Amino acid sequence: DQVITIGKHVKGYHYIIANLGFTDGDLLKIQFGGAEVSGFQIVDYDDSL
Amino acid sequence: NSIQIGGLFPRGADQEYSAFRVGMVQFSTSEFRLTPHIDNLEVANSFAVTNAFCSQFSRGVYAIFGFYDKKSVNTITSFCGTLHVSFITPSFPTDGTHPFVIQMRPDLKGALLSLIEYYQWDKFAYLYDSDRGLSTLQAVLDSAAEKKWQVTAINVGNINNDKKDETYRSLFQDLELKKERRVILDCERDKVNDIVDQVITIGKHVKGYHYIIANLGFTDGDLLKIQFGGAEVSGFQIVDYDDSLVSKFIERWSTLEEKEYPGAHTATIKYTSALTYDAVQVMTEAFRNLRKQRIEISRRGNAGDCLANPAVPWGQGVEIERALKQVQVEGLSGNIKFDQNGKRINYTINIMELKTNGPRKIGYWSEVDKMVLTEDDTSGLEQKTVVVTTILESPYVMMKKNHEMLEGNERYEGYCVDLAAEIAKHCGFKYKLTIVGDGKYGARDADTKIWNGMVGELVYGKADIAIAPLTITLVREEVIDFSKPFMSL
Amino acid sequence: TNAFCSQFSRGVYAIFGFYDKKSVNTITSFCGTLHVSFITPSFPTDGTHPFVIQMRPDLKGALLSLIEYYQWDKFAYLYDSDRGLSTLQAVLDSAAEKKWQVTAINVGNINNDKKDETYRSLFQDLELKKERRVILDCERDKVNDIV
Ligand SMILES: O=c1[nH]c2cc(C(F)(F)F)c(N3CCOCC3)cc2n(CP(=O)(O)O)c1=O
Structure with a gap:
């Protein structure tokens, strides 16, 4: 900001x-x-889990 | 003595309606009264404007204070044009010469x-x-x-x-x-x-x-x-807060309620709302000036049929309109002074900027004199034009052939002048040439120890640089710090 | 406005007529509210006013x-x-x-x-x-x- x-x-x-x-x-x-x-990032949303 | 006025406020005008409901009472002398019949409506729709113009014609008002927009300016000025019903507003400064319609917004x-x-x-x-x-x-x-x-x-x-x-x-x-x-x-x-x-x-x-x-x-x-x-x-801006009437008003304004006047606690007034306060001032100063000359403007049970064939006036016509167009009040916009038409004469639109500190003012526009720059002239902030002290001895700086034609830092030419213009690009500054009085490149006096010429002006105070042929010697290196030499004679 | 209500006081079903730029807003508001169809060979309105039937096509x-x-x-x-x-x-x-x-x-x-x-x-x-x-x-x- x-x-x-x-x-x-x-x-x-x-x-x-x-x-x-x-x-x-x-x-x-x-x-x-x-x-x-x-x-x-570590939580990559383009994956299975 | 209790004159009926209309007033067509929009559907979304709250602060505008506030300064009407405010300015009604804190301006009124208890002699007169300004009984409204305020009708809120969506003014982009000429249907509801037409109804509410005739609803307030049925009740027989003497002035309507409405806000028109683009899709209704041709409705308001037409109905008010024929039926002679006066009209005052802070909306559009109407294109043309529409009679009986008072524009209070200045002409931007x-x-x-x-x-x-x-x-x-x-x-x-x-x-x-x-x-x-x-x-x-x-x-x-x-x-x-x-x-x-x-x-x-x-x-x-x-x-x-x-x-x-x-x-x-x-x-x-x-x-x-x-x-x-x-x-x-x-x-x-x-x-x-x-x-x-x-x-x-x-x-x-x-x-x-x-x-x-x-x-x-x-x-x-x-x-x-x-x-x-x-x-x-x-x-x-038109409501300049550094003035008398505004500062008095904004003290009253900032102390108001949250639910008695919606959107009023804020210490800045909208110009649509601000002129509405200055409207009520005009909306009686005419009528009380009218009672100074004893004009009974009274009427009867006016037919609620605007669309009468034929369409007669309400009587008396211009008698209201003369009063409105003469009012020289002072409001929180400046000199409210109209003309024979309804546009404002002699107002004070003042030009602002936006510096880091805040919205600075830099002067004003006002019909007579176009753009007055009444700003702080003490905002110079300069890069002081150094006194480059220089002897006059060719093939260095010499006096050009048109020596009485132009003035200042274009007169001299030579080796020192093109050196000064080239050194100024690198050491970035501004400069103004100065020929020393007596000549005498440098000389300490016999006993008085007063320097002579360009050393005398570089040392004491009246110079900042000496772009000139000075020979680097020992007795001039002590008092003045030279640069590494540009010429090996 | 006078003549439109004189036509409304006869209960007309299609109004032919012209409009300038100073009367465009009176007509397309009235015919939009009072749903009376209005057929016109004038300049077409900007925007999407319903219940006007414009016939000067488009320049x-x-x-x-x-x-x-x-x-x-x-x-x-x-x-x-x-x-x-x-x-x-x-x-x-x-x-x-x-x-x-x-x-x-x-x-x-x-x-x-x-x-x-x-x-x-x-x-x-x-x-x-x-x-x-x-x-x-x-x-x-x-x-x-x-x-
Ligand atoms: O710093 C000095 N720079 C000088 C530069 C020049 C020039 F050549 F014009 F650039 C001259 N001239 C020599 C020829 O006659 C005209 C004047 C004298 C200079 N002097 C006095 P100096 O003691 O005689 O050297 C200085 O003191």
């Missing part, structure tokens, strides 16, 4: 959410900005 | 054209709103020919409430492919809050993208979203 | 297809604001995409003493920018006055 209000999610600013469960947050805020945000 | 259409010339634009995009009319679109296109603009007017007022997210993004992605880093947003309040959110999510509020919220009441929105981005967002 | 698309056949980007779209701005709103939205440079002048509200001054101020203020591709957009009475 404080990246967005000061406008640091435009094209260029790469991020790495180093937290094990990357999609557990509110990613539909910087998804459409233009900043490549990588991440880490 | 001139203030937008003045502002752009101050920023000197040519390359807008003019996202506008279809439902709020197009009279401003035919003032920045009709006047785009003369001043060579390249308006890229995109209608955004037809956007569905499910395809909102997709279309506004595809809107600016289209404007990005044309590289339009200037938008002159034109909508009403709730579409400005929906655009500013969709500007942020796609990250178009960084440094560069100027905006102009062309809406009369710039601070009525949610500006603490793009305040800290970096995008200069100008604007327009 | 809005044909004007956009004719320009593409001539391949323009240098118009001078002189419009008359007495028939709906709905066509101007089309060749400004479609002026974004196809890279056009419309210079839309209101040639509408102009009285008769300035008819030999405003137009002779008008075309010179197109010739000074060298516009050669005017898209005159008026009803017949105003077209012959420009021509």
